Amino acid sequence: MSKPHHATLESIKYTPGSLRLLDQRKLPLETVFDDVLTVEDIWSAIKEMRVRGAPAIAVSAALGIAVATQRKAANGELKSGREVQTFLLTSCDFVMTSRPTAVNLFNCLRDLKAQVDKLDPTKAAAEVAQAFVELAEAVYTNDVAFNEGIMRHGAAHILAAAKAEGRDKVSILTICNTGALATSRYGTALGVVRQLFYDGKLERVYACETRPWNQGARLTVYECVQEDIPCTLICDGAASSLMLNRKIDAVVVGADRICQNGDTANKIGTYNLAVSAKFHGVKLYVAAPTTTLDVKTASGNHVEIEEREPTEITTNLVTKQRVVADGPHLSIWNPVFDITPSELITGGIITEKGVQAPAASAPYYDIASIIAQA
Amino acid sequence: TLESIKYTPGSLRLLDQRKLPLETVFDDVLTVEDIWSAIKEMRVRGAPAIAVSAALGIAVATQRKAANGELKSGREVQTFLLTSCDFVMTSRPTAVNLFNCLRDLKAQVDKLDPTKAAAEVAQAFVELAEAVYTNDVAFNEGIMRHGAAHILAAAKAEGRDKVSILTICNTGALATSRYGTALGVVRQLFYDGKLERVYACETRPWNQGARLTVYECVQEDIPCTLICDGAASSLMLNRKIDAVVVGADRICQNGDTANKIGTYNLAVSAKFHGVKLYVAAPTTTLDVKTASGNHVEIEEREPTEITTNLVTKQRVVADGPHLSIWNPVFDITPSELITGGIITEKGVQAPAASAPYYDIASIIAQA
């Protein structure tokens, strides 16, 4: 019903009865939207990474199932109140099979499943479908609200630390894409960057390329260009040299799964960034909504790390040429996430609840408490 | 075979290392302008290969000009040789090999007889240029033996029979005359049946690792695993890596090492994970004239290396007035982070307890 202030592109285009997803693989050269009509469409979109970013995955999954179930209710494939309920639970389990590392998808759909059980199966199929639609629409609006909070908490905290020192403007180093493309609206870590920019307090955001999928070079740069946000693109390996030679106020990254102790699963390279950040005395912040927090996982070693097709590294995602030689004694290691241990999150964890600073020593973070906050 | 430098008396051909692994193209070097451009465009690259091809390139071009009467006298050849060494040195600044080699060649040209025939003065330089090729071969033969012996012994102390090596960029036969430096060590470990795996960083933006190092390992059946640069920290935590073995472009008096961008990042992580780091380079990569890393000129290159698909010349990054690209192609690894040692043809020099960890002048003066 409302356009975002600050530039659409939004990766998720929703209107009652219709879901369209921006193909984030084709940016920045091409702007393509694909219709999501079935549960199979949304599963594929997540798996192929047409839609990506932890929150965007969860929100589009809820909306995708809602539009598809509403469709099946209208045409005749469904059926009955009970079997709409049955289809919704079955669709939630199936969509959850797409990508394992980011918890947002699991937190959202499991919470939706519990609410689906609470629904009345006696209702006239379409009534049960519309009830789920409203629940799915709620997770979109909630994420918008979560990001509005993150931006404020993040920018104010970083600016207070800046003015405690002798600095009026901040330089931020980031990785991957955590803007409007990775979320419903504004973003998380890039949301903080946006707020600092609007206040006239951002000197520069430094963006890591983020191999092999290039979320930084392709998506983050794109977002900064559309809004005239001062941005500098670097190669992932140049991060250490950057922090030594130039003053970086904070490393602000996103998250896919934050464990109970604080251990953060995020895009591959984030751990590398955290190790270097500690070496150079640059405080590291993790920005994520509380739906990215995971009480069910105790520590980082219990997180399933997604590995993807070796063609992401060996082939051009554009010219389709195999840019790497092939042989029987060659292997490709392609994990698309790593773990940043809570020890290396020196700045704090930024949610919509506020900014949670680490403890002096062991269990640096209590994630259950952050979720329990008002 | 898979050599980047193809030399035979009167002819120099250079493999276009930009086009590998998809294409194998050799270009004739006929003029001093050809060799300057080859280095600048990075058709030939890698510190030692740059210096060797520069000497051979000047030698071939001059011999050709002395043959067809383009250079009439012996002093005309002498003047051309001295000025050509200065001109080629203007190509790429960071790697010292080019400068050490050509400055050493200039002093030898100065003591040549200018009254002699044009062909006679040119042939004298040819033999000097041929010498720098053979010397580099000999340097690398030493490096691979010293490095492999030290690393294997270090692993045997921890109770391991085979080693896992993590590297960056390309330091094999493509980057040198023969065998290589850091990948030379990897080769020697592989031949002895003592290498479990070499892990190769992609090495953005030019992709020396993904394109050249992988290629070399494939041609020789060397067990290899390609990773993205950012995955290096996760690799070292999750898997046992015995040593990080890297090359060099300029090694300062105190030990500070200029090497391909990302090497410093690798060194920082190596210290965090307790993985000893080795720098493998010939003594012609050592630099007494530079005291420390802050006095090294770091080459920055065209932003299209990052923003465009590498020939095809198509942009893959959005463009705007408030976007800039930071493209340094080297960084400094301080001597503190070289925990394993510096591997030369002289041997493996371990770091001192404190202070300046290395004495480069002492290494050069060894037998």
From Swiss-Prot, chain A:
Pathway assignment: Amino-acid biosynthesis; L-methionine biosynthesis via salvage pathway; L-methionine from S-methyl-5-thio-alpha-D-ribose 1-phosphate: step 1/6
GO BP term (any one): L-methionine salvage from methylthioadenosine
A single MF term (Gene Ontology): S-methyl-5-thioribose-1-phosphate isomerase activity
Entries under PANTHER family matching the protein: METHYLTHIORIBOSE-1-PHOSPHATE ISOMERASE
Pfam families named among the record's database cross-references: IF-2B
Site (Transition state stabilizer): 176
Domain of life: Eukaryota
The protein's name: Methylthioribose-1-phosphate isomerase
Family as reported in the entry's similarity comment: Belongs to the eIF-2B alpha/beta/delta subunits family. MtnA subfamily.
Reaction catalyzed: 5-(methylsulfanyl)-alpha-D-ribose 1-phosphate = 5-(methylsulfanyl)-D-ribulose 1-phosphate
KW Signal (keyword) present: no
Its job: Catalyzes the interconversion of methylthioribose-1-phosphate (MTR-1-P) into methylthioribulose-1-phosphate (MTRu-1-P).
Cellular component GO terms, alphabetical: cytoplasm; nucleus
Subcellular location: Cytoplasm; Nucleus
Keywords noted in UniProt: Amino-acid biosynthesis, Cytoplasm, Isomerase, Methionine biosynthesis, Nucleus
Enzyme Commission code: 5.3.1.23
Keyword check for Cell wall biogenesis/degradation: no
Enzyme category, top tier: isomerase
Active site: 256
